[PDB]
Design a protein around this nucleic acid. Structure first.
Ligand SMILES: [Mg+2]
Ligand SMILES: [Mg+2]
Lengths: 780, 778
DNA sequence: ATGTATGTGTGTATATATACACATATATATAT
DNA sequence: ATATATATATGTGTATATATACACACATACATA
């Protein structure tokens, strides 16, 4: 059959079969670009066309064959390699072995067996972000390595090389092109002003308009590169794409190793790429980026997408907290936070970042959700479409947990030249250990179970507050890493019971036995167990089905009530079949009613890279000093700003008192007015930095403050030359200097500066959490 | 059967005690399954012991257009279906669920107890699409096959709110069920500054306390359909295969509902089918005509007008690119769009496209990325996460002037302004582009006119020194034509011929008998290439003469190459005959088509209008633009006089405030007193300096009745000598402009006759500069 | 040589569907 | 009693698919005496 989304060349499998190309693209918008470009008729006499080029789609992400295949060493000696039934029945790989005419029991070592291919090179036209240049190009290389390495030896697998970033200067008709994101960031941070450049990001090939696809296809054969492999490559394919992760963990801790001048000149001159040198840059950079996207930071407890959602949601609902649809808020946060990915997964994260039900992931959600957001009974998988449902910002919890005057003092993620969101938030409470979570990633796994709220409040109040009895003893335990105050799992919104048997916790359900009608009434499932998955699991097991007649659900939307029915006189035969250990009952062995709480505390740290803890105490002890130094920073910044504002307004007061004697109307322009104001003892000030010190560090704030002009005094309205305005300004100067005395008294106290403000914020976060838990997280 | 939650008692001893809540999608089933499980928060509600769920799958197929009554020998017409209607997966589901039988009639109760449920209950949306269209099609299906169940109370429905309004303080909302009821309500108010209007698009947008208060009163809000005797004619008009009944009905608006009928419906809790079809279905069909047929003034539909308004609002600060889905989120937020996102993004994509043969010859946007080609008909664009749009800023500035948009009637959604009723362009843009749509009752199809003909017509109307001025005025008086009006052959390399009462368009071939090759070098107007090539391969009458067909096309240029089997040209010449209207080779290769028009537009203040020729559309267009120039000049004259009055108090206050000494006074009331005791005029400063949407009556009615904010909010920067000098020359420039405004209010033929000539010239050179740069504006 | 039925096609609407990667604990079905 | 494939599920990503309404000029497929 002609396979799906396939355009053959006119010379496939004929007398000039070997000189034809297959430009295998990633989707269909890329094929739309390739169809646009291979049909430059007389505007490109040196370019390719469909006389010797074809097109086929890779279907998204290629299946890997390096872990769906098995070796069988034959008794003749020569081992054989049998595929899986899933790998045999993939449509994309069946399609491309149908197009090129490949064979699985031909090694393609001589040339009269390589002349029986339908056309003799593959060229992968993929993207340049790490998701497409590193991942699926690596899996394609792995497929051709695992089944026919002789074609990678002789030269059969090729690729284009397109730009990811173009930067256009005003005036010049040649842009500056970049192939990697960190190269752009290193180029851009060295600059001094980027307000005459335009930065374009090209996710996918279909973002290239006409006047640059013509430039890309005047030089088509100039940018095709061919792969070679050496002996140092087979172990790297087994590390990066083999069935064991310990190799991948121990390689994937270290960062990417940059490229030498000889290797770079050799690649950009002779245009061949070593497969191992591709794996040790592009695929490794992909896997580090995937770790950064899919594993939470240990300070704020959230991923990178959810941190963009939080920043864009604080900024979106700023003026008035009116709700919007999920797709409209998603368009906002993809516009203003520089989100460079697809739109469907962003809307899925906005939906799941607002759910609240017994057993949801987030116990303290950022948003209030307005509509239908799914239930326990399908695990939140049955929410509405984003067309229907709405979200708004849970404003007082975000006000108390993430204080707004601390978001000025954080390191930010700069994207495309201007800032997007923080590197990390630092909440008032250790929010990384307060919720649930279970993800895979590259190399590692993330799994947490939430802690009690009162345990965490006891530990933080024991650390900070000086007259709690557990003050110095807790500091001793932080010096020696021993545990004193208990840190239990959370039992909120869960009615079953929890037991510790050795080095793990176990969570149990609740049944209700009856011999009057031989019916067991299940009333609760263990932690984070969906209902219909439990019912189908208890229905598939044939050893358990021999004792039940009918299994019926009567549960409400927030409370479990399952009803089984037993076959007559079958309560007795369960006990000999399903034996009762001390750790679980015979019914709880029978009805699948306990689970183990097994944690994988693998986080990412500031400045990137994995970190791996052994207990929740280690995460708390790593979290506390960041909040300590952030309090010290905000108090010193406030001290500097208050001195400078006293200095500013106690010259406005004397200008109001001396404007009649000064006679400002007599003078000609701003030059003579600034000169006659410099002679009467008015300080030159920087009005913008004093009114709005946005992100200015304290050296920046006292370094460019006294280097301004008299704009603070010259934009005074005649409204405020009145006597009630004088009284108002004098009393606000008195309040500012009283605040300055309070600030310089707060900078000294025990055990560290800013130790009472943080206790006040603990109490504020606690009452906001209590109010939210009472109102079903609606904050009525 | 998928998406079907079986009730516990379906098909048993108490099967007739059971309901089937047929919802419309899957989010609706999420709502209904949330509602039917309030176990002890709703002890008087329903549950799954007597209630099922099933999905209607979007929009129901109709059977009235897909069935045949065939007459047999015995004297009876049996009703035999179609193979397409028989294989519809949604209707197969409900027939298998309810246990219906097609050859039964269910007249007796012994037959009406052989079913599996007791009633079908349509839980549909309350917006006009779901309440009118698919509920009428469900009624039409049950009428066309089993009218005796509509007689005996089998088809039921819920009744939900469409708009809830929440008063501050009070604990009961106001619920409106129709949109025009809320619009007439909200126009009556004077202060809607503290009410929160909630639009509920589908029923899955309903919050938890709202669904609790809707499921405590479930049987309070179910209704039942009663079948009339006049209903057969209404079911044949609205859903039958004859369109002229539907044209003849749907001119006049919806008949309002009386008080006796209202009290009967809300009291005995039953619905006549005819009273439903003449309100809900008719209101839907009028709404679909409004959404799917253009206005003859601006040329654009409702969605494209929202997209242009949101694009002018979005790209105002800088003309920075956005994606398609991000700009779509913007225009769905600020222009109050109440529909899905996929259709809006498709509308933005097709509003940005520009290729030879696209719908728009003068697009609103500049498209950046892959926006499709001639060959697949523009259906080969990118996904909306890839491609970008940008505002074609100077064309939008010249065609739709910004100072005219303050003086237009607007549309209110939910209280706030969203977008105009129409734009009034400088050129008649409704006859300058293409289009081919169906709708309810009517068809829309246009073919664009030459630009030069339209420019000559409008310059003959407006300019008094043009020697075809009074002739054209006589022709407007007596409805005759003088000046030609040809179709647009721009970017088309075939040729056009007028034969009788229509134009035909012809493509170009090139023949060579030395190789038996015909080379097609041009297709007719708006013919996709791959659709043409696959259409020529299905005709086996033509396949017996050709061997091989190869496409060598460019990105924007056609080049098709056929191959003939030997000794078959003479058989083509003698077999496909030649008339004097089309060649034999063009008869063989499908190389002409007719430019056949259906000029059916909507008019202002709602309603269809149907024209006969393009001259009627031009002559209807001209007086709106004329009157709009007159009222913008009146507005400018008023604002200039008021601003002269405002600044010739500020300048003398700068002259006299050195000894007036306002720094001596206590507060602003004493200052306002002493300013009014020296002759300064009280002014409304926030409406003199920014008249946004104030008419001239409320401009000269409430602006001299303000305060002294204009004079008390001056910065001390303003009190210098250079600022005095600049205010003096600015007063001089406003005085000169006021003299020019009063000088050109009185000109001939009508006020503002040279200004519209200048805007003609600016739009024409912007169109030229956009055609030279492939509509990229380099 | 006519009276029939089908059959895509355009814009603006209504409601859905699917493949793949990644780690690890649990569950299921044979084969020494 | 035991190894060994196979299957599933979680979040953040990469790609695509498909049913219905509405009007009418036009094209292709057997019947019509
Ligand atoms: Mg991509
Ligand atoms: Mg609807």
């Amino acid at each position: 059959v002609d396979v799906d989304k396939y355009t053959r060349a006119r010379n496939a499998g004929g007398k000039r079969a070997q000189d034809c190309m297959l430009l295998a693209a990633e989707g269909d918008s890329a094929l739309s670009l390739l169809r646009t470009g291979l049909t430059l008729g007389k505007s490109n006499p040196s370019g390719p066309s469909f006389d010797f080029c074809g097109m086929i789609s890779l279907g998204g992400v290629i299946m890997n064959a390096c872990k769906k295949v098995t070796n069988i060493t034959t008794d003749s000696g020569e081992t054989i390699m049998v595929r899986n039934e899933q790998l045999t029945n993939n449509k994309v790989l069946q399609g491309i072995v149908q197009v090129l005419g490949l064979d699985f029991n031909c090694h393609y070592k001589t040339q009269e067996e390589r002349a029986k291919l339908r056309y003799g090179c593959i060229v992968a036209c993929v993207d340049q972000d790490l998701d497409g240049c590193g991942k699926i190009l690596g899996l394609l290389l792995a497929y051709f390595h695992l089944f026919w390495p002789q074609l990678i030896i002789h030269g059969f697998v090729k690729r284009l090389l397109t730009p990811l970033i173009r930067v256009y200067e005003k005036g010049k008709t040649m842009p500056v092109e970049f192939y990697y994101e960190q190269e752009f960031d290193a180029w851009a941070k060295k600059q001094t002003s980027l307000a005459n450049h335009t930065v374009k990001y090209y996710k996918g090939l279909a973002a290239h308009d006409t006047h640059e696809v013509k430039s890309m296809f005047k030089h088509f054969d100039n940018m095709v590169y061919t792969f070679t492999l050496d002996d140092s490559a087979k172990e790297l394919f087994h590390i990066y794409f083999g069935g064991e992760s310990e190799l991948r963990k121990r390689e994937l801790c270290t960062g990417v190793v940059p490229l030498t001048e000889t290797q770079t000149q050799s690649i950009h001159s002779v245009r061949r790429i070593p497969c191992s040198l591709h794996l040790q840059v592009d695929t490794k950079a992909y896997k580090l980026d995937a770790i950064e996207r899919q594993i939470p930071n240990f300070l704020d407890g959230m991923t990178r997408a959810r941190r963009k959602i939080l920043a864009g949601g604080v900024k979106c609902f700023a003026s008035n907290n009116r709700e919007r649809k999920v797709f409209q808020f998603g368009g906002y946060v993809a516009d203003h936070m520089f989100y460079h990915h697809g739109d469907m997964s962003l809307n899925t994260s906005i939906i799941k970042a607002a759910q609240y039900y017994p057993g949801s992931s987030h116990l303290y959600p950022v948003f209030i959700g307005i509509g239908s957001f799914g239930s326990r009974h399908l695990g939140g998988k049955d929410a509405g479409s984003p067309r229907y449902i709405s979200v708004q910002l849970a404003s007082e919890f975000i006000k108390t947990m993430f204080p707004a005057e601390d978001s000025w003092l954080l390191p930010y993620v700069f994207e495309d030249g201007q800032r997007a969101e923080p590197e990390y938030y630092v909440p008032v409470l250790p929010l990384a250990i307060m919720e649930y979570g279970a993800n895979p990633s590259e190399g590692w796994k993330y799994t947490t179970w939430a802690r009690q709220l009162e345990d965490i409040l006891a530990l933080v109040r024991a650390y900070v507050d000086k007259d709690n009895p557990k003050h110095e003893l807790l500091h001793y335990a932080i010096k020696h890493k021993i545990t004193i105050l208990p840190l239990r799992p959370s039992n909120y919104n869960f009615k079953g019971h929890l037991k510790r048997f050795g080095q793990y916790y176990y969570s149990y359900g609740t049944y209700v036995i009856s011999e009057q009608r031989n019916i067991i009434t299940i009333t609760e499932l263990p932690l984070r167990v969906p209902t219909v998955a439990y019912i189908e699991s208890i229905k598939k097991s044939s050893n358990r089905m021999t004792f039940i007649e009918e299994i019926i659900d009567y549960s409400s939307s927030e409370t479990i009530e399952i009803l089984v029915k037993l076959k007559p006189n079958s309560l007795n035969r369960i006990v000999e079949e399903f034996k009762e250990t001390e750790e679980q009952d015979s019914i709880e062995n029978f009805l699948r009613l306990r689970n183990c709480l097994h944690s994988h505390l693998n986080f990412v740290k500031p400045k990137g890279g994995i970190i791996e803890f052994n207990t929740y105490y280690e995460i708390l002890y790593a979290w506390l000093p960041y909040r300590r130094e952030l309090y010290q920073k905000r108090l010193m910044r406030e001290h500097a700003v208050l001195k400078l504002r006293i200095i500013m307004e106690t010259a406005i007061v004397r200008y109001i008192n001396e404007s009649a004697e000064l006679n400002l109307s007599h003078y000609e322009d701003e030059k003579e007015a600034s000169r006659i104001l410099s002679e009467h003892g008015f300080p030159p000030l920087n009005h913008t930095l004093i009114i709005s010190p946005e992100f200015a560090s304290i050296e920046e704030l006292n370094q460019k403050a006294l280097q301004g002009c008299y704009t603070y005094i010259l934009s005074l309205q005649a409204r405020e030359l009145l006597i009630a305005a004088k009284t108002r300004r004098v009393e606000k100067i008195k309040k500012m200097q009283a605040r300055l005395d309070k600030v310089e008294q707060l900078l000294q106290e025990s055990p560290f500066p800013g130790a009472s403000v943080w206790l006040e914020e603990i109490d504020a976060v606690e009452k906001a959490i209590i109010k939210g838990r009472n109102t079903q997280w609606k904050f009525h």
